[PDB]
């Protein structure tokens, strides 16, 4: 109870700020991810004993893929704990306290295949969920762990305030299918320029918190130029994988996934940023303005891609 979680002085400091990279050192993690619960949520919303069991099965159920690993978990989690510290007094406790967990358990035993590849493989999962197929087996990864002895984190919660907890983290995960984004944020938009947003409206504080998971989750785009160009190395690792999957199926895959294309991969960049990413963080910064500096990093990595294209790296 009165035992508190700390780092080091370094990451003490720039934890509180967007653009915190977690570092190569994976036994950390789990402690930079509980001083971001105790500093977020408080030491008592979680028994430590039962915090720390549920943290150690959900990172043994992600896979060691180049991307959508333990650390893209947690990367997004610390994405999330910036966006909650800097918005303190817009979100309730039960949305603290899922919404960090949603982001935890947002991937849980990904392969590193889109829903298309599963789909076209026809993967028993494609069969079982037809939409959002990844994010329904995540959520259902995320209950699973929960049941295990002595894992269930929400244990104190009352009836109702256990199914709100749940009802907010599959909404949470749902919504980082990327598929889903583009639908909310115009809808997201229009309700803002019309002045009809209400975060009173629980269909609202949805998709805003559907947004914020698309912003986490696209968080590699927001970070030191560095950070976002190795982690595009990761992100092309297994685009590549899953287009000579579809190779070996007899298909020819988008130029995305094609290695064959990777002189088109600056060019995608500067598509992503301003059909996905720009926007994401344009719309988030209109709904919660202390989130403007996600948007201002992910400018200034637009424009390390135009001088990729540029030659000037
Ligand atoms: C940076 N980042 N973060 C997440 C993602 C992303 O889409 N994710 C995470 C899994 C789904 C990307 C990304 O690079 N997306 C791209 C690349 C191209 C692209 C298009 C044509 C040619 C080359 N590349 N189109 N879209
Ligand atoms: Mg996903
Ligand atoms: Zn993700």
Same mark, same amino acid.
């Given at each position: 109870g009165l035992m508190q979680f700390t780092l080091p002085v370094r990451l003490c400091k720039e934890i509180?700020?967007?653009?915190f990279d977690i570092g190569?050192? !994976? /036994?950390?993690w789990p402690g930079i991810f509980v001083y971001m619960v105790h500093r977020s #949520?408080?030491? +008592? #919303?979680?028994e430590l004993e039962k915090l720390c069991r549920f943290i150690m099965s959900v990172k043994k159920n992600? =896979? =060691?893929?180049?991307?959508?690993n333990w650390k893209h978990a947690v990367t997004v989690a610390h994405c999330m704990y910036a966006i909650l510290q800097n918005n303190?007094?817009?979100?309730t406790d039960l949305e603290r306290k899922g919404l960090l967990i949603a982001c935890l358990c947002h991937? @849980?035993?990904? =392969?590193?295949? *889109?829903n298309s590849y599963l789909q076209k493989f026809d993967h028993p999962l494609a069969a079982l969920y037809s939409t959002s197929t990844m994010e329904q087996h995540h959520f259902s990864q995320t209950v699973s762990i929960l049941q295990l002895?002595?894992? /269930?984190?929400? *244990?104190? @919660?009352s009836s109702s305030e256990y199914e709100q907890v749940l009802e907010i983290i599959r909404k949470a995960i749902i919504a980082t299918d990327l598929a889903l984004y583009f639908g909310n944020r115009k809808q997201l938009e229009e309700m803002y320029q019309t002045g009809s947003?209400?975060?009173?409206n629980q269909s609202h504080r949805d998709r805003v918190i559907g947004l914020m998971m698309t912003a986490c989750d696209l968080? +590699?785009?927001? &970070? @030191?130029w560095p950070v976002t160009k190795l982690t595009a190395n990761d992100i092309y690792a297994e685009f590549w994988a899953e287009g000579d999957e579809m190779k070996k199926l007899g298909i020819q895959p988008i130029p995305m996934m094609? =290695?064959? &294309? &990777?002189? !088109?991969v600056p060019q995608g960049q500067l598509g992503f940023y301003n059909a996905v990413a720009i926007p994401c963080y344009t719309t988030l910064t209109q709904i @919660?303005?202390?989130?403007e500096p996600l948007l201002k990093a992910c400018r200034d990595n637009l424009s390390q891609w135009e001088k990729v294209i540029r030659g000037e790296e």
């Open positions: 509180e700020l967007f653009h190569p050192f !994976e /036994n950390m #949520c408080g030491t +008592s #919303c979680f992600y =896979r =060691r893929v180049p991307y959508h303190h007094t817009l979100f991937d @849980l035993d990904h =392969r590193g295949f *889109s002895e002595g894992h /269930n984190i929400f *244990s104190t @919660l947003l209400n975060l009173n968080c +590699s785009v927001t &970070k @030191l094609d =290695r064959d &294309k &990777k002189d !088109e @919660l303005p202390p989130t």
